[PDB]
């Protein structure tokens, strides 16, 4: 069943992260072990070798494209723009994380301005909460009744992925397997 998660031509944005449910099927990890040598396979909670003996009911598989210097922010108990407003992972996390460079599949010479992240937000998120609202975020004293203007920002901004960039800024495809 590890086909659409890995070998897919379309991945959503950080603020609209995908959520996939895989269950009631054999989940042989033969590909995982052979997934090498550009797949970081940092697993938190259980050893990568000790997976066949374990059993799980719901195997979530998140998937998005982010900057390299932000993949560190997927680790449990961390602070940052990617880990405060877009995607939150609880401290008591039991799951694996797989990240790999995807410059050849998600870059463009002009620049792929199609990946979005919410820069600023009034409150930090809760474990496993979706942020799909695109309302105007107001910080000033003047209350804008859904009217654009100063101190009434639109809290969405686009990336600047390009091939001829440094490795840190190169797009990284990250998939997180959370076991419940």
């Amino acid at each position, epitope marked *: 069943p590890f086909d659409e998660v890995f070998n897919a*031509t*379309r*991945f*959503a*944005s950080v603020y*609209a992260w*995908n959520r996939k449910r895989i269950s009631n099927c054999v989940a042989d990890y033969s590909v995982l072990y052979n997934l090498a040598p550009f797949f970081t396979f940092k697993c938190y909670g259980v050893s990568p070798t000790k997976l066949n003996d374990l059993c799980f009911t719901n195997v979530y598989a998140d998937s998005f494209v982010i900057r390299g210097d932000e993949v560190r922010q997927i680790a449990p108990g961390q602070t940052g723009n990617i880990a405060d407003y877009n995607y939150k992972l609880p401290d008591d996390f039991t799951g694996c994380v797989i990240a790999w460079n995807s410059n050849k*599949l*998600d870059s*463009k*010479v*002009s620049g*792929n*301005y*199609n990946y*979005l992240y919410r820069l600023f937000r009034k409150s930090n998120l809760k474990p496993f909460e979706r942020d*799909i609202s*695109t309302e*105007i975020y107001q910080a000033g004293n003047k209350p804008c009744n*859904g009217v*654009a203007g100063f101190n009434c920002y*639109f809290p969405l901004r686009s990336y600047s992925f390009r091939p001829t960039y440094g490795v840190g800024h190169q797009p990284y495809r990250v998939v997180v397997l959370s076991f419940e």
Partner: antibody
Amino acid sequence: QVQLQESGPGLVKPSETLSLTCTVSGGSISSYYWSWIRQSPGKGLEWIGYVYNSGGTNYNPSLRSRVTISVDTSKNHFSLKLRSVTTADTGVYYCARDLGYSSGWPDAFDIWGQGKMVTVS
Amino acid sequence: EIVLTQSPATLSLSPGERATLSCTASQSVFSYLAWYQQKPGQAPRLLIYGAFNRATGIPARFSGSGSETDFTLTISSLEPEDFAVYYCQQHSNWPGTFGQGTKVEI
């Protein structure tokens, strides 16, 4: 076969919302970039936005706040909701679908369906 | 912003006659512009994508090029149909906009 019907029959009174809705007749949404387009005299063909299997979208910055598209993964009643309808929006709208022979870029509008009317009086 | 000034405006022909078209980009399309067709009364349609590749379904005689300023569609066949508008399209710099087009008569 994949006729993209539009069942939303709501015409618009001044300054109210735009309660239109597209519908699907065969085809399955899956992961195509369904979108919306419009055209009228004054300003011709125009692109509002496109939606994914989730809230993945990108809106037109000429008019951005008013236009708020929705997503219906299963019941596929995705709508092009709008607020502060003017006396200028009167035009024939259209419902757009892309081709799945490419990468993450909605570029090739192929499938199309008959449009709709709106007027103020 | 991305702008197109497609020319010309006046043209007349009959079946199986010559043909010529052009598109007037401003800054840079590289190879991502497109050409479309919309007969008068029904929905639009797509003719060319990629600026050098014909799309599926389009018949044998439809092909064009592109270099941001020197686009060329070399066609000389006007079937009993296809006298309608031809629509230029471009999308590389957000947002993407179409063209206006022109016509030919009998």
